[PDB]
Amino acid sequence: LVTTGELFFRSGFGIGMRKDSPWKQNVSLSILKSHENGFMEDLDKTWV
Amino acid sequence: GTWNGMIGEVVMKRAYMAVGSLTINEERSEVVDFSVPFIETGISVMVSRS
Amino acid sequence: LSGQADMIVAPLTINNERAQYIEFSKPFKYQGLTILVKKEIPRSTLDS
Numbered sequence: 001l002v003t004t005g006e007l008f009f010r011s012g013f014g015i016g017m018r019k020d021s022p023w024k025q026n027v028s029l030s031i032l033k034s035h036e037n038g039f040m041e042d043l044d045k046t047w048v
Numbered sequence: 049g050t051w052n053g054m055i056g057e058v059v060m061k062r063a064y065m066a067v068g069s070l071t072i073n074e075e076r077s078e079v080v081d082f083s084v085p086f087i088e089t090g091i092s093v094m095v096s097r098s
Numbered sequence: 099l100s101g102q103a104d105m106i107v108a109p110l111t112i113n114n115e116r117a118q119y120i121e122f123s124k125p126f127k128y129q130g131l132t133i134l135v136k137k138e139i140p141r142s143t144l145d146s
């Protein structure tokens with residue numbers, strides 16, 4: 001299988017639910033914490 | 049502990065909203081609110097095409 | 099929105115509608131958009 005040309009719609013996937021929940025701030029906290037320890041690269045080397 | 053520059057202006061309310069090519073950092077996250085980014089970046093490596 | 103599940107974890111895009119309905123956190127994983135085809139077996143076509 002081959003990819004195309006140039007990629008478009010350079011978006012992001014994150015996490016969000018109803019507004020009754022300040023958990024999403026802790027979610028941002030966790031994503032930056034893993035930015036400070038290299039954990040998404042662990043997920044990448046495991047899966048992607 | 050005291051912020052300067054654009055972050056200092058925002059902290060001291062001198063600058064209400066911020067505009068500039070500044071990335072997202074945890075230290076700034078504790079003192080300001082990071083909005084939704086409009087473009088991506090990160091730890092990239094560039095090499096000669098050769 | 100009906101209250102069945104509490105939090106969502108899934109790679110969902112963030113368009114305008116569901117963002118108006120519910121807010122989202124930082125995008126844990128960046129992404130783009132590409133067409134996919136099963137390439138083609140290299141074959142030179144000619145008679146003789």
Ligand SMILES: *[C@@H]1O[C@H](CO)[C@@H](O[C@@H]2O[C@H](CO)[C@@H](O)[C@H](O)[C@H]2NC(C)=O)[C@H](O)[C@H]1NC(C)=O
Nearest residue numbers: 020021022023024025026027028029030077078
């Ligand atoms: C969401 O993030 C907030 C931001 O800190 C967390 O709030 C802290 O809660 C801990 C105990 O859970 C306290 O010791 C801190 O004083 C709180 N900090 C502040 C200023 O809010 C919270 O833990 C996270 N999750 C929850 C449970 O909401």
Ligand SMILES: O=C(O)[C@H]1CN(CCCP(=O)(O)O)CCN1
Nearest residue numbers: 053068069070071072073076089
């Ligand atoms: O947020 C900021 O302050 C700027 C800073 N720039 C730093 C350039 C990389 P280095 O620090 O020189 O290694 C990147 C864009 N955002």
